[PDB]
Amino acid sequence: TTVVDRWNIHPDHLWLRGQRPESPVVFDETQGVWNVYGYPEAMDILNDHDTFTSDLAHLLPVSVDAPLLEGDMSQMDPPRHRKYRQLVSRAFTPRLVADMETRVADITRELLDAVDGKPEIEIAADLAYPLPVIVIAELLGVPAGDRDLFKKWADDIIEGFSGFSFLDTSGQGEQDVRDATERLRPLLDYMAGHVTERRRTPREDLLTHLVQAEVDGERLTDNEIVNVANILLVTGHITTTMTLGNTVLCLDADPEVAAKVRADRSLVPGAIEEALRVLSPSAALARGTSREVEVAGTVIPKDQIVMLWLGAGNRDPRQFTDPEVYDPTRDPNPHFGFGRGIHFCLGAPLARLEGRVALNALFDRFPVLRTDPAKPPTFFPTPDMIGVNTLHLRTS
């Protein structure tokens, strides 16, 4: 019995149980998008960014009244995206992430210290959710003493810098984004002050590296840097906590694999990777056709919206043997969890670091963790995001 069937996870998604359409590409008419379920097809689509573009503004109906989030690279197309990515990736580096490990462990310990010994913890509220927030804030020059100032802004930040948002958008939803954005002057004055400081007295940190990022002299403006930082405050945050909770849920569902993983911590990252393939926080990606293109015998007209169901592609039997089986030992595990191509997830090594550190400490602190049917795991309502929003676990 899989983790999906145990908790009746997203019953709307049949591919979560191996029920797949015969064709990889199936046009909807609802819902006027082209759904892609196949692994080789998704790979082809993701690699061909020219044919399958990422800026969908011209493709959205006037019913979609969405505020454009400044600096959002995922909604951005080349050549501008290329320059923006070259620059941001000059700063957001593997070395900077790796150097954060001790800090991540220290934050993780403090969080676990608060609930150590309790007969029941809730994984999201106690660990999975606060950790990515604090970690990314410190990377952006937010000192500990200013945590109360950021929990204060917590709600407004995420409404104001979440972004789009095709499947889940509503009129009232976008309305909320606008209102939050109207109350963000003091956050953007906050970031601007730290950017001005890093340009004045440079440090070995992210904000400074964003200021100094070069590529033949062509740099980011202070305003673009502030926008990059504010976006980073929320991008990957929710998905990171989902990923943390999803891994534990997959492990709970199979006590023998859980025991094996606890015994052999070298399997932790693999268990995290496998959870991303099994329960995808980013289940759906949107692309726009720039021309008429044939994908697997299916002709897609120009200016059509393609929905890449990465969760389904992650279960394509052509690519994955026993696709419905959570197996942390899969090596390699070329899932679509972080995407593929010029838009490949930038925060992936940070996500993987927080995951490995948090998981190992959780197992260390709590030798026994089991779900409660009286307090069942809940899930995000969204169709494009497959992750837990709450976990209740027994110390037992």
From 115, 207, 213, 351, residue interacting with ligand HEM (rule: CB under 6 A): 351
> Among 371, 392, 391, which residue's Cα sits nearest to residue 380?
391
Consult the annotation and say whether 183 binds a ligand: no
Given a contact cutoff of 8 angstroms between Cβ atoms, the answer to whether 10 and 312 are in contact is no
Contacts with ligand HEM by CB under 6 A: the residue count is: 23
Task: Single out the segment in contact with ligand HEM by CB under 6 A; choices: 58-66, 150-158, 342-350, 364-372.
Answer: 342-350
241 lies in the site for ligand HEM, by CB under 6 A: no
The single residue among 337, 362, 371, 384 that binds ligand HEM, judged by CB under 6 A, is: 337
Question: Is 103 known to sit in a ligand binding site?
Answer: no
Q: Residue 297 — left, alpha, or beta (φ > 0 → left; ψ -120 to 50 → alpha)?
A: left
Residue 285 binds ligand HEM (CB under 6 A): yes
The answer to whether 338 contacts ligand HEM (rule: CB under 6 A) is yes
Handedness of CA 317, 322, 326, 327 (dihedral sign): negative
Q: CA-to-CA distance for 204 and 206, rounded, in angstroms?
A: 7
71 sits near ligand HEM (criterion: CB under 6 A): no
242: Cα separation from own chain's centroid: 8
- Residue range at the interface with ligand HEM (CB under 6 A); choices 170-178, 192-200, 206-214, 277-285: 277-285
360-365, Cβ contacts within 8 angstroms, sequence gap of 24 or more: 360/265, 360/268, 361/105, 361/108, 361/109, 361/112, 362/112, 362/123, 362/127, 362/248, 363/261, 363/262, 363/265, 365/112, 365/116
Q: Is 87 near ligand HEM (CB under 6 A)?
A: no
What character string, x for contact with ligand HEM (CB under 6 A) and - otherwise, covers 120-149?
Answer: ----------------x-------------
Residue selected from 35, 53, 54, 319 as contacting ligand HEM according to rule CB under 6 A: 54
Q: Determine which residue in the list 347, 365, 388, 393 makes contact with ligand HEM, applying CB under 6 A.
A: 347
Distances (CA, A) of 102 to 97, 98, 124, 264, 348: 11, 9, 21, 21, 18
Q: Which residues contact 323 (CB under 8 A, 6 or more apart)?
A: 18, 314, 315, 316, 317
Is 343 annotated to bind a ligand? Reply is yes
Q: Please, which residues bridge with residue 53 across strands?
A: 288
Among 35, 51, 53, 74, binds ligand HEM (CB under 6 A): 74
Interface with ligand HEM by CB under 6 A: which range of 158-166, 233-241, 250-258, 319-327? 233-241
Shortest gap between Cβ of 163 and ligand HEM (angstroms)? 10
**DSSP code, position 314:** T
Measured between alpha carbons, how far is 345 from 332 in angstroms, rounded to an integer?
Answer: 18
Say whether 83 sits in a helix, a strand or coil: helix
R_g of the chain computed on alpha carbons: 21
Question: Rounded to the nearest whole angstrom, what is the least distance from the CB of residue 347 to ligand HEM in the complex?
Answer: 2
Q: Is 90 annotated as a binding residue?
A: no
Residue 81 labelled as part of a binding site: yes
51, 282, 319, 333: residue in contact with ligand HEM (rule CB under 6 A): 282
* Residue numbers belonging to the annotated binding site for heme b: 81, 85, 287, 343, 345
* Residue numbers belonging to the annotated binding site: 81, 85, 287, 343, 345
What residue ranges bind ligand HEM (CB under 6 A)?
54, 73-74, 85, 136, 232, 235-236, 239-240, 243, 281-282, 285, 337-339, 343, 345-347, 350-351
